[PDB]
Write an enzyme that holds these catalytic residues in place. Structure first.
Site, short mmCIF file in Angstrom:
data_model
loop_
_atom_site.label_atom_id
_atom_site.label_comp_id
_atom_site.label_asym_id
_atom_site.label_seq_id
_atom_site.Cartn_x
_atom_site.Cartn_y
_atom_site.Cartn_z
N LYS A 1 0.86 -1.17 0.00
CA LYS A 1 0.00 0.00 0.00
C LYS A 1 0.90 1.23 0.00
CE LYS A 1 -3.98 2.38 1.01
NZ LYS A 1 -5.43 2.24 0.75
N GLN B 1 -1.04 5.65 2.13
CA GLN B 1 -2.17 5.50 3.01
C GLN B 1 -2.68 6.89 3.39
OE1 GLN B 1 -3.62 2.43 4.82
NE2 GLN B 1 -5.11 4.10 4.98
N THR B 2 -3.98 7.13 3.26
CA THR B 2 -4.55 8.39 3.72
C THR B 2 -5.56 8.14 4.84
OG1 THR B 2 -6.41 8.59 2.13
CG2 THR B 2 -4.24 9.29 1.35
N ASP C 1 -4.65 0.28 6.22
CA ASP C 1 -5.12 -0.86 5.46
C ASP C 1 -4.18 -2.06 5.58
OD1 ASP C 1 -6.37 1.29 2.74
OD2 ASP C 1 -7.16 0.94 4.75
N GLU D 1 -2.32 -2.36 -3.43
CA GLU D 1 -3.56 -1.65 -3.11
C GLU D 1 -3.44 -0.16 -3.39
OE1 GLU D 1 -6.90 -0.87 0.34
OE2 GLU D 1 -5.48 -2.55 0.53
N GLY E 1 -25.39 2.22 -10.43
CA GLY E 1 -24.26 3.05 -10.82
C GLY E 1 -23.01 2.25 -11.11
N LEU F 1 -22.44 -0.43 -13.13
CA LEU F 1 -22.17 -0.75 -14.53
C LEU F 1 -21.45 0.41 -15.22
CD1 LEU F 1 -25.49 -2.63 -15.39
CD2 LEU F 1 -23.32 -3.60 -14.72
N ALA G 1 -21.66 -9.32 2.57
CA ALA G 1 -21.74 -8.12 3.37
C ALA G 1 -21.36 -8.46 4.81
CB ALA G 1 -23.15 -7.53 3.31
N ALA H 1 -15.91 -7.78 6.62
CA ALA H 1 -14.88 -6.95 7.24
C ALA H 1 -14.78 -7.13 8.75
CB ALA H 1 -15.09 -5.46 6.90
#
Lengths: 225, 230
Positions: free
Chosen positions: A37, A40-41, A49, A108, A144, A146, A198, A201
């Protein structure tokens, strides 16, 4: 070289968890995994991350170059910070150095395919070109997607970076008419490698690894390396 | 004098960036400059949930020249909404004809898309970008100031340029008061990749006919609006 960039069609598509999920499935197929990564922000609000990937997938080769407090795109974050982004050579060489035989290296992104990642004006797309990486694209199943998916695929083809497929970062329960339709439609424009349930995480490491092993096609994952 | 109309396609960088209120705001500003405005919406989905962008534009801006064509009940992508209803998408030609029939000298015609530049509007794989090429339109792109906007906007601008459709500029569909750090930074960054025509006050959509008119006149540069039709 065996390098994938992982890029998301928008913010909060589940990019980091996709990186962790693929990393986990690859480790379980006996493949060595590194995750990079470069930038990173949003560290002010607690973003890291690489730590998320380590906890969720047990990846130990976790490389980065810069971290900014602001939840902005890299250029904006650095600008507010008064501190330049990393150089192009820094990013490309970091990644090239991680690359080993039998090893899957994931890169990433931060802020999208087309935003500045390195000085001056260098994007994730540019880095992909430089290191001959294909791109794995993280998408939603929402209205949105597609449009965003097609736009990203056009941008990848514009500089001849291969698309390694899509991953739906968060698959709803129950799906719904829109998500269900989008998933068929997404499958008509590119290969859908996985759809992560879903809430994935929030799983503990062991549950996460079981989810990840189930989410990806093992032949595909093994074929990457 | 222009002996034909000026055509702008109005597209968004994503879902719910405020395309409709932008169409209405531009329409209202152009009308107050003495320009005749038509607004066209080739494909309208979500009609069973009350979605009607044309009706909304007429409400907000008082626009009477409102041109529709295909209406699908379900609020999804056109192709999916059409299939759900056992209906076909329109043909490319039908869309181009709907627009061309609006031609008057010195008219401004705004063609409002359905959900992003590359959304399929007609079979096979015909998009708002294709229509823009067909009618020689420029594209006005509606953006957020939210995180994610820069990538979305750059993706949209690249895709326009790929088929040589000129960008007429950007409109921030909802601008917060006061702007936070992120929104303010993003506006500066957006102004570096393209001309930002306007940033409409958050809540613009709920303004009065009178207040919306005043908002619209203040939101755009009058020289830019006045130069749209010659």
């Amino acid at each position: 070289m065996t390098i994938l960039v992982v890029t998301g069609t928008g913010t909060g598509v589940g990019k980091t968890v996709v990186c962790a999920a693929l990393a986990s499935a690859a480790r379980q197929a006996g493949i060595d995994v590194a995750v990079c990564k470069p930038v990173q922000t949003g560290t002010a609000r607690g973003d890291d991350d690489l730590a998320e990937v380590g906890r969720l997938a047990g990846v130990t080769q976790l490389a980065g170059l810069a971290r900014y407090p602001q939840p902005m795109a890299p250029a904006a974050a650095a600008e507010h910070a008064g501190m330049a982004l990393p150089a192009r050579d820094q990013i490309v060489r970091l990644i090239a150095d991680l690359d080993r035989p039998g090893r899957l290296t994931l890169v990433e992104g931060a802020g999208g395919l087309l935003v500045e990642l390195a000085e001056p004006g260098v994007t994730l797309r540019d880095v992909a070109v430089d290191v001959a990486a294909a791109a794995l694209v993280v998408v939603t199943a929402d209205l949105g997607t597609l449009n965003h998916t097609k736009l990203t695929l056009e941008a990848l083809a514009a500089q001849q970076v291969s698309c390694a497929g899509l991953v739906i970062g968060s698959w709803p329960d129950p799906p719904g008419l829109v998500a269900a339709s989008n998933r068929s439609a997404l499958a008509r424009i590119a290969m859908v490698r996985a759809a992560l349930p879903a809430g994935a995480a929030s799983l503990d490491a062991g549950d996460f690894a079981a989810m990840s092993a189930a989410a990806f096609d093992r032949n595909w994952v093994a074929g990457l390396v």
